[PDB]
Design a protein around this nucleic acid. Structure first.
Lengths: 140, 177, 45, 123
RNA sequence: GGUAACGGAGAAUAAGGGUUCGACUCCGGAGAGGGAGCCUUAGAAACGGCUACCACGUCCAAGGAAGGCAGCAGGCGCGAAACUUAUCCACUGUUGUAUGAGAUAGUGACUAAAAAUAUAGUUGAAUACAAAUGAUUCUUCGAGGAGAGGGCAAGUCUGGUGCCAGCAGCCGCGGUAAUUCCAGCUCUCCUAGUGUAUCUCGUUAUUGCUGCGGUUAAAAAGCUCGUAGUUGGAUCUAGGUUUACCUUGAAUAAAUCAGAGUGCUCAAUACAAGCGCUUGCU
RNA sequence: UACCUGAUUGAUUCUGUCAGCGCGAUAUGCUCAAGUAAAAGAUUAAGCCAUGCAUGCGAUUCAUUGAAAUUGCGUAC
């Protein structure tokens, strides 16, 4: 059982702090290497340069080739793989393009049947991918 | 230099976005009292919630507590003047009994059509918008304006509005010219 | 199977259809009034 | 056009009288300050140029409207205890044309670079 | 040692107990590219003061002479990320002509309140202002974003495609009869807003003091001795010297939060105002 | 308002997390009748800065009211 004495405040506080580190959320939010490990460095979006277009085989039981793109981030030069959402939108993305990349939705974890991809494309050539898909705007 | 400007929110979103019971109940409130959107009804829900919470917090205290006395009479006073509480029902145990309909009734929009100045509640609203009503010699253009008890019997057409004596509207003037 | 070269296949194949026209639906309070009077909603089958 | 004066106070240490003026102009536009001035002068049996209305804001839908007025004992006290812009507005004084702030500042800075009597010449 | 650390007043969330944050208008501290040294002074280790070195610039007729926007406005870089090289001392203040302090207008879907699309624009006046602008009084003419299997409100309608293209936060849809993709039509939610990404709080009794769990789901040290720490039996006036603790006061900046009053036309706000009759009272 | 719902199984009850759901901050997509208040180069680069401004006003008046200059005061707010 936990201590219950009237003069055990130090033990209770110190034990709580010691055991908070065994918590994934607390450790993930206070470890100290978060900025150097996260590709975005704690940001929500990041600009990058497209290096190549790749296809990722969907996980089972699904079958498809998800059209992803390899990007190098400008702010730190780290390489990531980002998903190009919507149908036939890989055509809009040319090699050596400036793309805005955002998280995929699950805070650094893969989403759906796409394995190992944690980012998606929001803008290409300073144009919204959704706008291009909907026909609102055209390629600069 | 310039200090922080004070702002407050008057609406709280429902915890569950989609429940048929709540959706139907709120759509009926929009129906009877002609309102514009769900924010209009959430505003009244929020004010009623504040009133009820204050009453409950006071009632936690005994009867003759100084704070209980002062705040309780103040709250009952305000409700009476708005016309939402019963002037015989002077107690917080009974202020913890009101509904959103009580407040929604005291809106200017409802009274405009209730007193016959307009046919439908939508008519009431578009009149209030087009500046055809006045209150105690004041042209009010806010359909949400609450009508105090004193103001209840001093609401008639604007002294200028073509339906209250004034230059004919655009349609009439076009026809005349 | 998928090849990375068939991107935008179905949207290209899709037959093109045009839209229609309708009177500007009532907006704001009027739409809510129409809703209240009208009151599954889309029971095609 | 019913002009009414309330909260009238006598300020001898400034030789005037301060009052809140309210005008009722149902249907009519906002009362011009000259018209208000004449009515207040008649009200206080005083010259129509020893009364200073100002700060007249108009309530909605016509009718009511409020402002302030200063009744002055005489024109010398008036154009002694008064900002220049008020007098210019009412014609008691005349505006003095002045160069803009930017150009005055630049001229001052340029003069700072010159010593002796050539400062007045430099421009 | 680390801090992606200026402290506080406070902010977000919020049964209660809390968790997180706080560069930022008020208070205190520190700095003026990095250090160091000093003149003047009541007050400075001042930088819109000087002196040197370091780094980096500017003008030279090559002998020399200079610079410090983390002030306002602008420019370049950096980035996901942030405004006009505009008008004035009329306002609050500085000892009061001077005040990029301060006040105005510009850009401004940060944001907060109130509201039009059914039953706005536009003309000349006044007003306002330091001049304006804009509102306020008069007068001329005169609807979009997500969705539609479940969670979760809403189609087993039609056409294309056949594990492809794609959708899908999660569970899952698609293999030639797809309510889930691409479209048309219809509906649903909210609505001048509505979605996406990262993060904080709730949800979460999944950090548990209130208040978790340890036979088998993660978790009792192989066992014992033992210092610090924590915790320690009953017992002194019932009847007929110290502490700890509790009660009540004192000392305890505003702004913010709660809250009293007060028709800014309501509200968010603001701190006002309300009465006679004029020389006014509260 | 002291609240939960979907997902491990042929089905069941648990542990448990993931996901949903409400608010707020920042960025951003699409879109925006008129108005009223109003934040706004903090985050990274206390990085670098073209150009304008941001600190000046009793005694001494042989200039033409008061210039110039010497004083004094302020520029430590």
């Amino acid at each position: 059982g936990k201590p219950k004495g009237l003069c055990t405040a130090r033990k209770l506080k110190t034990h709580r702090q010691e055991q908070r580190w065994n918590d994934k959320r607390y450790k993930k939010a206070h470890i100290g290497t978060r900025w150097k490990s996260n590709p975005f460095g704690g940001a929500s979006h990041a600009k990058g340069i497209v290096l190549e277009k790749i296809g990722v085989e969907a996980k089972q039981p699904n079958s498809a080739i998800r059209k992803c793109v390899r990007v190098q981030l400008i702010k730190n030069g780290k390489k990531i793989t980002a998903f190009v959402p919507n149908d036939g939108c890989l055509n809009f993305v040319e090699e050596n393009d400036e793309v805005l990349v955002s998280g995929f939705g699950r805070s650094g974890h893969a989403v759906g049947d796409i394995p190992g991809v944690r980012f998606k494309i929001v803008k290409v050539a300073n144009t919204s991918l959704i706008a291009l898909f909907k026909g609102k705007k055209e390629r600069p | 230099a310039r200090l922080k400007t004070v702002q407050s929110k008057v609406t709280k979103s429902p915890r569950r976005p989609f429940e048929k019971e709540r959706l139907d109940q709120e759509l009926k409130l929009i129906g009877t009292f002609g309102l514009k959107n769900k924010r209009e009804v959430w505003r009244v829900k929020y004010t009623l919630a504040k009133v009820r919470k204050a009453a409950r917090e006071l009632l936690t205290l005994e009867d003759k507590d100084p704070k209980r006395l002062f705040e309780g009479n103040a709250l009952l006073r305000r409700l009476v003047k708005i016309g939402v509480l019963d002037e015989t029902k002077m107690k917080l145990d009974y202020v913890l009994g009101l509904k959103v309909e009580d407040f929604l009734e005291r809106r200017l929009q409802t009274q405009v059509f209730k007193l016959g100045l307009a046919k439908s509640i939508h008519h009431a609203r578009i009149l209030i918008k087009q500046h055809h009503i006045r209150v105690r010699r004041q042209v009010v253009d806010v359909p949400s304006f609450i009508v105090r008890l004193d103001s209840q019997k001093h609401i008639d057409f604007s002294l200028q509005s073509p339906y209250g004596g004034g230059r004919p509207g655009r349609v009439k003037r076009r026809t005349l010219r | 199977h998928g090849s990375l070269a068939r991107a935008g296949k179905v949207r290209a194949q899709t037959p093109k259809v045009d839209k229609q026209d309708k009177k500007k639906k009532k907006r704001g309070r009027a739409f809510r009034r129409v809703q209240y009077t009208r009151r599954g909603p889309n029971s095609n089958s | 056009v019913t002009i009414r004066t309330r909260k009238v106070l006598t300020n001898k240490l400034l030789y005037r009288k301060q009052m809140v003026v309210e005008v009722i102009h149902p249907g009519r536009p906002t009362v011009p300050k000259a018209d208000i001035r004449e009515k207040i002068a008649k009200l206080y049996k005083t010259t129509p140029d020893t009364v200073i209305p100002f700060g007249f804001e108009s309530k909605i839908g016509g009718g009511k409207s409020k402002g302030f007025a200063l009744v002055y004992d005489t024109i010398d006290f008036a154009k002694k205890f008064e900002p220049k812009y008020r007098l210019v507005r009412m014609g008691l004084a005349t505006k003095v044309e002045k160069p803009g702030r930017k150009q005055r500042k630049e001229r001052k800075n340029r003069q700072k670079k010159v010593r002796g009597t050539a400062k007045a010449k430099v421009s």
